[PDB]
Amino acid sequence: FKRYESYVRESQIPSKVKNLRISIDPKAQTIILPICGRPVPFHINSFKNGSKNEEGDYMYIRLNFNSPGMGSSVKKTELPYEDGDDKEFVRSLTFRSTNKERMSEVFKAITELKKTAVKRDQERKTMEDVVAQAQLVEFKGRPK
């Protein structure tokens, strides 16, 4: 299990979060969701993918999270969750909002945060097998 954590202390939750709405922290790589009056963090590594639907005056966002069965393309060697037969998982959360424009921007920002996280993880994996070499010693005369 690639150990990740959103916050260690409640004081790290930004002061901006207070309107009982969906908010994104790019610094902590975390999506903050309004569940029954509580600011619930979800790390971008627990997030799988989402969808957005427009319905009358409301805009719906469904966020899907990583769970066994609905697994991602990751190999068996590194799971986005800790192994556990007795572990239950939040598979999806569906939210609605009257403000369509902001809700579309929030969805774009979640999708961008996921793309940046995946790109950084690929870049890390490509660098893990790069052995740091010694420095080339220039020839003090006329080189061939």
Binding site: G37, R38, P39, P41, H43, P68, M70, E88, V90, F95
Partner: protein, 429 residues
């Protein structure tokens, strides 16, 4: 008598701030008079005898005081400062003899954990700490969506004569994944604790119906306001309002009959969506069914819409009549179109999917996954192209084009004459 009062407190996620008060008689909350809230101005009052326990925790607007009642209701009061904790602790202890518990919540951002059905709320624990809790009073419905999957629908916070306007993004649906051979017991325990409507009396049930989209042996239980589909792995609840159209179409094999429901919003099975439900009956399948209705309810609501008893008639006819009576939707039967072979439809392929096209009086309908409904009012032009014993039909509409391939050439003239008769522009390359 020292009345302790707090200004700027919100009740159950109210948009308007109010004044909270602690008295020896109980808890009181009143909205602040500065906001025109179309809404009763009446103070919320909770008697001291109804208070069971009180927890203190981090909310959206600062600190939250969560009050558990003896009537299995949860009251949420948010907007407190961290300094208020000492005063609240002393006053609640002095007035009610109840300990104020400090509840720390998991901030790890993990979506895995253990669910725990507490008396008044469903709690999701991450590393032995609560991540979130949902009061049972906020849960509208729960439905097994697969062998390890539980979907909970929450009451939509819209316009009720007894609730303050909520401010923000609202949670509508929560799906849990419960591994192990365990999700069915959890669903049963959730049903018992959430106190969902009980002693439900289906008006009519139909057992062992073989669907094609998605393929499965579902039981169909019909109620006054809703239709239930029970399956081995997935239970669906469809509201009668969400049924847009009913089609009753004979298959060209002359051995089967198709009943097709258009549903909006489309049914979900994991990631895939089913806007059309396709049921397949044998034409020789006969069923006798008595409606489970009182004679007073039948006469008042269903007289002339439903029969009290259906004799031994074909199952698909009884089902189509019951669906018509309960959804108030018209059943669409095959139109005046007759193929060269005197058939009500024509064999064709849509991309890699082989199927049957029905030319109905108001629309073109394809009946094999994927199901395609095309109203004639939305069709711009139909182009007939030569692939040949067969020809292809391209239907152009405001949202794209659909090419139906591999149609027998003998069917070209009947189709063109029918489409011209319906006022559709036919072009022949």
């Amino acid at each position: 008598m020292s009345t302790v009062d707090f200004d700027t407190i919100f009740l159950n996620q109210s948009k308007a701030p109010g004044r909270f008060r602690i008295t020896s008689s109980g808890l009181g909350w009143k909205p602040s008079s500065q906001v025109p809230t179309k809404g009763k101005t009446d103070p919320f009052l909770l008697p001291s005898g109804d208070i069971l326990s009180v927890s203190w925790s981090r909310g959206y607007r600062g600190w939250e005081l969560r009050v558990y009642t003896r009537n299995d209701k949860v009251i949420m009061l948010d907007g407190f400062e961290q300094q208020d904790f000492q005063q609240l602790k002393n006053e609640i202890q002095r007035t009610f003899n109840v300990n104020l518990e400090h509840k720390e919540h998991s901030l790890r951002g993990w979506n895995w954990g253990k669910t725990q059905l507490t008396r008044a709320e469903l709690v999701f624990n991450v590393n032995n700490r609560p991540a979130w809790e949902i009061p049972y009073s906020e849960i509208s419905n729960s439905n097994l969506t697969g062998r390890h999957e539980i979907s909970m629908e929450l009451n939509p916070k819209t316009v009720d004569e007894n609730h303050y306007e909520t401010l923000g993004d609202e949670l509508v649906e929560v799906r849990l994944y419960v591994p192990g051979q365990k999700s069915q017991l959890f669903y049963e325990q959730l049903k018992d604790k959430a106190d969902f409507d009980t002693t439900s009396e289906a008006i009519v049930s139909f057992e062992d119906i073989l669907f094609l989209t998605p393929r499965g042996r579902f039981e169909i239980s019909m109620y006054a306001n809703n239709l239930r589909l029970r399956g081995q792995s997935y239970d669906y609840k469809i509201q009668n309002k969400n049924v847009l159209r009913i089609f009753s179409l004979p298959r060209l094999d002359d051995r089967h009959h198709l009943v097709i429901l258009q549903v909006d919003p489309p049914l979900r099975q994991g990631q895939t969506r089913y806007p059309f439900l396709v049921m397949q009956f044998d034409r020789n399948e006969e069923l006798e069914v008595e409606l489970n209705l009182s004679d007073e309810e039948y006469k008042s609501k269903y007289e002339g819409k439903l029969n009290r008893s259906y004799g031994t008639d074909s199952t698909y006819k009884i089902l189509s009549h019951c669906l018509r009576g309960l959804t108030e939707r018209r059943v669409i039967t095959p139109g005046s179109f007759q193929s060269q072979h005197m058939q009500p439809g024509v064999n064709c392929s849509l991309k890699a999917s082989e199927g049957q096209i029905y030319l109905l009086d108001k629309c073109l309908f394809f009946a094999t996954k994927p199901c395609v409904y095309l109203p004639y009012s939305g069709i711009i032009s139909v182009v007939t192209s030569r692939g040949s014993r067969t020809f292809d039909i391209e239907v152009q509409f405001s949202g794209g084009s659909h090419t139906f391939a591999n149609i027998n050439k003998d069917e070209q003239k009947p189709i063109e004459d029918f489409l011209k008769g319906q006022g559709v522009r036919v072009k022949n390359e």
